[PDB]
Amino acid sequence: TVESALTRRIMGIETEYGLTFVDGDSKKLRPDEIARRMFRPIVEKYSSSNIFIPNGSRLYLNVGSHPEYATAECDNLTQLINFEKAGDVIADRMAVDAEESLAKEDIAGQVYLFKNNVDSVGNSYGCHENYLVGRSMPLKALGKRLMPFLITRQLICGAGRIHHPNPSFPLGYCISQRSDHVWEGVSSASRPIINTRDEPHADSHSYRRLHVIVGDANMAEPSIALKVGSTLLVLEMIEADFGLPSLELANDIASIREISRDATGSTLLSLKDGTTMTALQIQQVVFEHASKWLEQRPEPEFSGTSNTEMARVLDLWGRMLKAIESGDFSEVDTEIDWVIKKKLIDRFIQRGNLGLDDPKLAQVDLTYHDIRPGRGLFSVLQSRGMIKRWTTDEAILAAVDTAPDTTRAHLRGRILKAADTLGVPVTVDWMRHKVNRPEPQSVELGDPFSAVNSEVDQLIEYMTVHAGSASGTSLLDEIDGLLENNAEEFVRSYVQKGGE
Amino acid sequence: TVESALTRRIMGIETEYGLTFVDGDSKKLRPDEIARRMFRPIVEKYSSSNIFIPNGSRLYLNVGSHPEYATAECDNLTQLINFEKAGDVIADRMAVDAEESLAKEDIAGQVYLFKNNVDSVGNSYGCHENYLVGRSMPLKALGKRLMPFLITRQLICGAGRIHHPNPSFPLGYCISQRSDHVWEGVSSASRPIINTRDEPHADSHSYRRLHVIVGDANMAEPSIALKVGSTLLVLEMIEADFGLPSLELANDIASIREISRDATGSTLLSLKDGTTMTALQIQQVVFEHASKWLEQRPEPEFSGTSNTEMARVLDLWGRMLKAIESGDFSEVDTEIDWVIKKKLIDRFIQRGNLGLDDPKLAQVDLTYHDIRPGRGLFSVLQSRGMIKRWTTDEAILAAVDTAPDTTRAHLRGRILKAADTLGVPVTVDWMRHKVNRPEPQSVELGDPFSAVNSEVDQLIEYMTVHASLLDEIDGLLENNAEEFVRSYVQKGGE
Numbered sequence: 001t002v003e004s005a006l007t008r009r010i011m012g013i014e015t016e017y018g019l020t021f022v023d024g025d026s027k028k029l030r031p032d033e034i035a036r037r038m039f040r041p042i043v044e045k046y047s048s049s050n051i052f053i054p055n056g057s058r059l060y061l062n063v064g065s066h067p068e069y070a071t072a073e074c075d076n077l078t079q080l081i082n083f084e085k086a087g088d089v090i091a092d093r094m095a096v097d098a099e100e101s102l103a104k105e106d107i108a109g110q111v112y113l114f115k116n117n118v119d120s121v122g123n124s125y126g127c128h129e130n131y132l133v134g135r136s137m138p139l140k141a142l143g144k145r146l147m148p149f150l151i152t153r154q155l156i157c158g159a160g161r162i163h164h165p166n167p168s169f170p171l172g173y174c175i176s177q178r179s180d181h182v183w184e185g186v187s188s189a190s191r192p193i194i195n196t197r198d199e200p201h202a203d204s205h206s207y208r209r210l211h212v213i214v215g216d217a218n219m220a221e222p223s224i225a226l227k228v229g230s231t232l233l234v235l236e237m238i239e240a241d242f243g244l245p246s247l248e249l250a251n252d253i254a255s256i257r258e259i260s261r262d263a264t265g266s267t268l269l270s271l272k273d274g275t276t277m278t279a280l281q282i283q284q285v286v287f288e289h290a291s292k293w294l295e296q297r298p299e300p301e302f303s304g305t306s307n308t309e310m311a312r313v314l315d316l317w318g319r320m321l322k323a324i325e326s327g328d329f330s331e332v333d334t335e336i337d338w339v340i341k342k343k344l345i346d347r348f349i350q351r352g353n354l355g356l357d358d359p360k361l362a363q364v365d366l367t368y369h370d371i372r373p374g375r376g377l378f379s380v381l382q383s384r385g386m387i388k389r390w391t392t393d394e395a396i397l398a399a400v401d402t403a404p405d406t407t408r409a410h411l412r413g414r415i416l417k418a419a420d421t422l423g424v425p426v427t428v429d430w431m432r433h434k435v436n437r438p439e440p441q442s443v444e445l446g447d448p449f450s451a452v453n454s455e456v457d458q459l460i461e462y463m464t465v466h467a468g469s470a471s472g473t474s475l476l477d478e479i480d481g482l483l484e485n486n487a488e489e490f491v492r493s494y495v496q497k498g499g500e
Numbered sequence: 501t502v503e504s505a506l507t508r509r510i511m512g513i514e515t516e517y518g519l520t521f522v523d524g525d526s527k528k529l530r531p532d533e534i535a536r537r538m539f540r541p542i543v544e545k546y547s548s549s550n551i552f553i554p555n556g557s558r559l560y561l562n563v564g565s566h567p568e569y570a571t572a573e574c575d576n577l578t579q580l581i582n583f584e585k586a587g588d589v590i591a592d593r594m595a596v597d598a599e600e601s602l603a604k605e606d607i608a609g610q611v612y613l614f615k616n617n618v619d620s621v622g623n624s625y626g627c628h629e630n631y632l633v634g635r636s637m638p639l640k641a642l643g644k645r646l647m648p649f650l651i652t653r654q655l656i657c658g659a660g661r662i663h664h665p666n667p668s669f670p671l672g673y674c675i676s677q678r679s680d681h682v683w684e685g686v687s688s689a690s691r692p693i694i695n696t697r698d699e700p701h702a703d704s705h706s707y708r709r710l711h712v713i714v715g716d717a718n719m720a721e722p723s724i725a726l727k728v729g730s731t732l733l734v735l736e737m738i739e740a741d742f743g744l745p746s747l748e749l750a751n752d753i754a755s756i757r758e759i760s761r762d763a764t765g766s767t768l769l770s771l772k773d774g775t776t777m778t779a780l781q782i783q784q785v786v787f788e789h790a791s792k793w794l795e796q797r798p799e800p801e802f803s804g805t806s807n808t809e810m811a812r813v814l815d816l817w818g819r820m821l822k823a824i825e826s827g828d829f830s831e832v833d834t835e836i837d838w839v840i841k842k843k844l845i846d847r848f849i850q851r852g853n854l855g856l857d858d859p860k861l862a863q864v865d866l867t868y869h870d871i872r873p874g875r876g877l878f879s880v881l882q883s884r885g886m887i888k889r890w891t892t893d894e895a896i897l898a899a900v901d902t903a904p905d906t907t908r909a910h911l912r913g914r915i916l917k918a919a920d921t922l923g924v925p926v927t928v929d930w931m932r933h934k935v936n937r938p939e940p941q942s943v944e945l946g947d948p949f950s951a952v953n954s955e956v957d958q959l960i961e962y963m964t965v966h967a968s969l970l971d972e973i974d975g976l977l978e979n980n981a982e983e984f985v986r987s988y989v990q991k992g993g994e
C-alpha cells in the first residue's frame with residue numbers, strides 16, 4: 001500500500017540556543033542574566049517569557065536558561081528549513097537589542113548565540129525533531145526499522161566537534177556532538193531517543209507525535225535537508241510496507257559513541273538476530289531501499305514534499321555515503337557540516353602545524369555555530385560560496401514575518417496578527433486559541449493540516465467588531481508630541497527644487 | 501471587441517521624494533547635500549548615483565536632487581501598490597542610515613522624506629504613472645476619452661493641499677496638489693499631461709508607453725488603487741471600443757485649477773462640441789460606463805487585474821462620487837487621502853478654533869506625507885486603524901527584497917541577485933541586460949510580460965562558471981582563544 005505513506009506530514013523543530021555575553025577575555029554576564037535581558041521586551045509586553053510569535057512559532061526561555069525556538073508546523077521540507085533559519089534571524093535581533101540596551105547602561109559586551117549542542121565543560125543542549133504519524137503505527141516496528149537508521153544517521157548529518165578528555169575516549173574529531181550525551185542520558189537512570197507518547201498536538205484518535213532527540217543542530221541547509229528528509233523517507237517506507245530488513249540491535253546505544261569516533265563507518269554493530277553489520281552498511285541498505293521507494297513513491301496531491309525534492313535528498317545522501325566509503329569528500333565538502341568544519345580546521349592545522357588540542361581549533365569548533373552574520377564562521381564561508389544553499393534568503397525573510405500558509409500555523413498567525421493590530425489580548429497554544437476579553441471565546445484546532453477554519457474567521461471578526469472621543473483625543477496629543485513645536489519655522493524652512 | 505482590451509497590462513510608477521534635513525528651528529543641510537549623503541553608500545559600491553536594485557526597481561538621484569524610485573514592471577494592481585510602498589521602506593532606510601552617519605560626525609539632525617508634490621515656496625515634483633498600450637492605439641481617441649477623465653480624476657483620488665496666496669486665488673483647502681503646477685506647465689512656453697512618444701521600454705512594433713503626470717502622490721493604498729484602477733478601466737473601455745462617449749474639452753487645462761478648488765465638482769467645463777458639463781458629471785458618466793464594462797469585462801487568463809479587484813475599485817469609486825454629490829464623506833473618509841487629511845485638519849481646527857492660515861495646519865499638510873513609521877501622521881492614523889488597507893504589510897516587505905514573479909522584472913532580479921552573490925559586474929536597463937566581464941555578454945528583453953528567458957539562464961550560468969579567508973577569520977576571532985573557549989559554560993536543557 002504505497003498510498004498509505006504520509007507524503008504530506010507535519011514536522012517541527014525545537015532549537016535550544018547556546019547563549020553567552022562576553023567582553024574580551026571574560027564573560028560580562030551570567031547566561032541567565034543575559035537571557036533575561038534578551039527577553040526583557042517580550043516580558044514587558046506580554047508579561048511572559050514564553051510566547052507565540054505571529055509566524056506561528058513558539059519562542060520561550062528554557063528551564064535550562066536557554067532561549068528556545070520551536071518552529072511552526074510545516075508540511076514541506078524547504079519550508080521547515082526556512083522557518084528554522086527564521087528563528088536564527090529573530091534570535092539574533094533580540095541579541096543585538098540586548099547589546100545596545102546594555103551599552104546604554106555602560107555595560108560593554110558582545111552576545112553570542114550558538115546553534116550547537118555542547119559547551120567546554122561537556123554539558124549538552126539539543127536540537128529536537130518532531131514528526132506527525134498515524135495513531136495505528138506500532139513501537140516495535142519503529143525499533144526494528146527506524147532506530148538503526150537513526151543511530152547511524154550521525155554519519156550523514158553530523159555537525160562535528162572536537163573531544164577533549166579530562167583526567168575512555170581519546171582526543172579526536174567527532175562527527176556528532178550529541179552522541180556521547182545521548183548515551184549518557186540513556187545509560188544513566190533517563191531520556192529516550194524516541195518517544196511517541198507525548199501529546200500529539202493533534203486529534204488523539206487520528207495521530208501521534210514522534211519526538212527525536214538524537215540529531216545534531218545544523219548550520220548548513222543541505223545538512224538539515226538530508227537529516228530531516230532521510231527520516232521522512234524512512235517513515236514513508238515504513239508506512240507503505242515497502243519492506244526494510246529488520247536491523248534491530250541487541251543494544252541501541254552500544255556502538256553510538258564509537259560510531260561518532262569513526263569517520264570510515266567501519267564500526268561494528270550487533271543485531272538482535274546475532275548478525276553483525278558495519279554502520280556504513282546499515283546506511284547503505286536504508287539508502288538503497290529509499291532509492292527504490294522514490295520510484296515507487298506517489299506525488300502528494302496537495303503540498304507536502306515533492307518527488308523532485310526527495311530526489312535531491314537522495315542525491316546528497318548517495319554522494320555522502322559514496323564519500324564515506326571512498327574517503328574522498330570533495331563532492332560534499334560544501335553540503336555537510338562535519339565535513340565542512342573539518343575542512344576548515346584542517347586549513348588551520350596545516351597553516352600552523354597545530355595539534356588537535358590547540359585552542360584556536362576549539363574556538364573554530366564553537367564559533368562555526370555562531371549565528372550572527374559576518375561574525376560567525378559559517379557566515380564567512382557562505383560569503384565565499386564555500387557553503388551550498390538549499391533555499392533562498394528571501395524565503396527565510398518571509399518566514400520570519402508570516403506563518404506557513406499550508407499548515408494550521410497559518411490560522412494561528414492570523415489571530416496573532418489581528419490581535420496585535422487590534423490591541424486585544426489573546427491566549428494561544430498549538431491546539432488551542434482563544435480570545436480572553438471582553439468575553440472569552442475559544443477555538444480548538446484539532447487538525448494541523450487545515451489552514452482554513454470558519455470559527456477562526458468568526459473570532460477575528462469578533463475582535464474587529466469590539467475593536468470614539470478618547471481615541472481622537474489621544475491621537476491629537478500624540479501628533480502634538482510627534483510634531484516639532486515651532487511649526488511656522490518648520491514649514492517656512494522647507495524648500496525644494498522642481499524635478500522633471 | 502471585448503477581448504482586445506488589455507486586462508493584463510504593464511504599469512509602472514515614478515515617485516520623486518521631497519527631502520530635507522532639519523535640526524529644530526532650522527534646516528541643517530542643503531537638499532543636494534543630504535541627497536548625496538543618502539546615496540553615498542550606493543555610489544561607493546557601484547560608482548554610480550543611478551542603479552537598479554534587486555527587486556527590479558530603479559533607484560536614482562534626480563537632477564532636481566530628488567531621490568526617485570521607479571517601480572519594477574507590474575502586471576497586477578495590488579502588486580504595483582506593493583512595490584510602490586516598498587520604495588518607501590527602502591528610501592526611509594537610506595535616510596536613517598544617513599542620520600546615523602551624520603550623527604557620528606557630530607552633525608545632529610532629522611531626515612524627512614515626503615511623498616507629496618509641493619513645497620512652501622510652491623515648487624512641484626510629481627508622481628508619474630506609466631501604462632503599456634498598443635502602438636495601434638490612436639492619440640486622438642485618448643484626447644477625446646482619456647483626457648476628460650484625467651482632468652476630473654483629481655476629485656476621487658486627490659491627496660489634498662492647503663493653498664496660500666502670495667501678496668489670483670484665495671486661501672482654501674484644495675483637493676489636488678498638482679493642478680496649479682500642471683496648469684503652469686501646459687500654459688507656460690511645455691510639458692504635456694500625457695505622452696505616448698517616449699521610449700516604450702518594450703518592442704517598438706508591438707507597444708508604446710503612456711506617461712501621465714497629472715496625479716498626486718498618494719499615501720493611502722486605496723487612493724492609489726482607485727487612481728490607477730480607474731485609469732485602467734478607462735483604458736480597457738477605450739481598447740474594447742466599449743462606446744464610452746467622447747467628451748472632448750475645448751481647453752484641457754482651462755478649469756483644472758478651479759476643479760482643484762471645488763469639492764462639490766460643480767465646476768463647469770466647456771466641451772469642444774459646445775456642451776457644458778460639471779466635473780462630477782464627467783466622473784459620473786465615466787463611472788457608469790465603467791460599471792457596465794465590468795459586467796462585460798472578461799477575466800484575464802494569466803495574472804492581470806482580476807474582475808473582483810476591479811469590483812473593489814468600482815465600489816470605492818461609486819462611494820466617492822456619491823459622497824461628493826451628497827456632501828457626506830463618512831463612508832470614504834478612511835479610503836481617500838484628501839478626505840482623510842481634511843478630517844484630521846478639521847480635528848485640529850475644532851480643537852483650537854484655528855484659522856486656515858494657521859502654521860500648524862500647514863504643518864499637518866506637510867507632515868502627513870512623511871514616510872517614517874511612527875513619526876508620520878499617516879502612519880499614526882493607520883496605527884490607530886483610521887486608515888483602510890488595500891494590501892498587507894508583509895507583501896510590501898516581501899516586495900522590498902524580491903522582484904515581481906509575473907513580469908520581466910523577475911528576470912532582471914535574477915540577474916542582479918546572482919551578480920551580488922557572485923561579485924561579477926553587471927549592467928542593467930529596463931530592456932537591456934549585460935555582463936561586463938570577462939567577455940561582455942548582452943541579452944535584450946523585448947517582452948515585459950515574459951518572466952522566462954533561456955538566454956538569461958545562460959547568462960547566469962556563465963556568471964556562475966566564471967566566478968585570505970584565514971586572515972579574515974582571524975580578524976573576527978577573539979585573540980585569546982583558550983580563555984574564550986574555557987569561559988563558555990552552559991546548563992543542559994530538557
Ligand SMILES: Nc1ncnc2c1ncn2[C@@H]1O[C@H](COP(=O)(O)OP(=O)(O)OP(=O)(O)O)[C@@H](O)[C@H]1O
Pocket residue numbers: 010011012013014058070071072073074130131132133200201202208209210430448
Ligand atoms: N501535530 C503535530 N505534529 C507534529 N509536530 C507538531 C505538531 N504540532 C506541533 N508540532 C511541533 O512540535 C513542536 C512543539 O515543541 P514545544 O517546545 O512547543 O513543545 P514541548 O517542548 O514538547 O513541550 P514542553 O514545553 O512541555 O517541553 C514544534 O516544533 C511544532 O512544530
Ligand SMILES: Nc1ncnc2c1ncn2[C@@H]1O[C@H](COP(=O)(O)OP(=O)(O)OP(=O)(O)O)[C@@H](O)[C@H]1O
Pocket residue numbers: 510511512513514558570571572573574630631632633698700701702708709710930948
Ligand atoms: N513596457 C513598459 N510599459 C509600461 N511601463 C513601463 C514599461 N517598462 C517600464 N515601465 C515603467 O516605466 C517607468 C520608467 O521610469 P524611468 O525613471 O526609467 O523613466 P524614463 O522613461 O527612463 O524617464 P527618465 O529617465 O527621464 O526618468 C518605470 O516605473 C517602469 O515601471
Ligand SMILES: [Mg+2]
Pocket residue numbers: 014068070
Ligand atoms: Mg520545547
Ligand SMILES: [Mg+2]
Pocket residue numbers: 514568570
Ligand atoms: Mg524618472
Ligand SMILES: [Mg+2]
Pocket residue numbers: 500514628
Ligand atoms: Mg519621466
